[PDB]
């Protein structure tokens, strides 16, 4: 059995999904879509770039929700069967949802566009930073930053596999917590092409802004579970997958943990269904006995339908 994974910040490239979209006229034509809900050409963007305006992450949220929903959308057309499960990262659990018909596809364009502007406005640019930290355990990360924080905000945000966790806050912050991490033993902490100081507490006033958004838009039922990032939960109300997208804002991204999960329930491959192969090569330092691989090459995209 095997699940699908959804990709989100940093997978996008120029260029990305154009071999697939030569051989399969129904990623334009979602993309055709998501570009009427935006009032510009998003296919265009994603081709053309240039790279600066595709990693505004108000434009590269819904660019990558695309492509996900494009990439499920040639996988149900040429006749492949339905994931046991769902999960994606960050913005991917948006494409996970779209993808078990929880949201309509043009409302969650739309929302994550407004979802990656209420980020981008949280705080003055110049004010947030996140870090990866390389090579320690989850627990030394959360002490090193309980110890840095000092009356700001430090935390970790992402949970991406063990021995790389990303941490975010205010910049001061980071800095003390990455000194610690160092200090604690970890391998590396790389500062990273942040600003936006995502899945921490600095997204609060962020999340009430979505919360307001999120209760315009229908929920339906999913028709295959979902993994959330917040709690590691398959929630089937509308009303609380709603309330996990909002907490998920401000709280850490439990990636690891959602992958065990699934491994848990008998899953034995990940597919990602996006650009790029990132929660492809972190599936493996997870679960070693579990196998992934990306669905964003025609040739790829076959050779799974011939399963």
């Given at each position: 059995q095997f699940a699908?994974?959804?990709?989100?910040?940093?997978?996008?490239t120029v260029g990305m999904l154009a071999d697939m979209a030569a051989s399969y006229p129904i990623v334009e034509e979602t993309f055709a879509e998501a570009s009427?809900?935006?009032?510009?050409?998003?296919?265009?963007?994603?081709q053309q770039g240039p790279a600066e305006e595709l990693n505004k992450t108000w434009q590269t949220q819904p660019a990558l929700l695309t492509a996900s929903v494009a990439l499920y959308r040639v996988w149900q057309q040429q006749g492949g069967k339905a994931p046991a499960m769902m999960a994606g990262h960050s913005l991917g659990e948006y494409s996970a949802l779209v993808?078990?018909?929880?949201?309509?596809?043009?409302?969650?364009?739309?929302?994550?566009?407004?979802?990656?502007?209420?980020?981008?406005?949280?705080?003055?640019?110049?004010?947030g930073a996140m870090a990866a930290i390389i090579g320690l355990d989850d627990a030394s990360?959360?002490?090193?930053?309980?110890?840095?924080?000092?009356?700001?905000?430090?935390s970790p945000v992402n949970f991406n596999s063990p021995g790389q966790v990303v941490i975010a806050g205010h910049k001061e912050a980071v800095e003390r917590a990455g000194a610690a991490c160092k200090a604690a033993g970890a391998k590396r902490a790389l500062p990273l092409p942040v600003s936006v100081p995502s899945h921490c507490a600095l997204m609060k006033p962020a999340a009430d802004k979505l919360a307001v958004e999120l209760a315009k838009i229908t929920f339906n039922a999913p028709t295959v579970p979902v993994v959330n990032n917040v709690d590691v939960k398959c929630e089937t109300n509308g009303d609380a997958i709603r309330d996990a997208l909002?907490?998920?804002?401000?709280?850490?991204?439990?990636?690891?943990?959602?992958?065990?999960?699934?491994?848990?329930?008998?899953?034995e491959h990940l597919y990602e269904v996006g650009p790029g192969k990132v929660l492809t090569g972190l599936t493996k330092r997870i679960v070693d006995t579990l196998t992934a691989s990306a669905l964003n090459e025609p040739s790829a995209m076959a050779a799974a339908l011939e399963l």
């Open positions: 699908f994974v959804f990709p989100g910040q940093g997978s996008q009427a809900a935006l009032g510009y050409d998003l296919w265009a963007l994603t993808c078990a018909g929880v949201i309509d596809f043009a409302d969650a364009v739309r929302l994550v566009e407004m979802r990656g502007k209420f980020m981008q406005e949280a705080v003055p640019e110049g004010t990360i959360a002490k090193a930053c309980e110890e840095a924080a000092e009356g700001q905000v430090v909002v907490r998920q804002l401000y709280n850490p991204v439990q990636w690891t943990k959602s992958v065990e999960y699934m491994a848990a329930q008998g899953v």
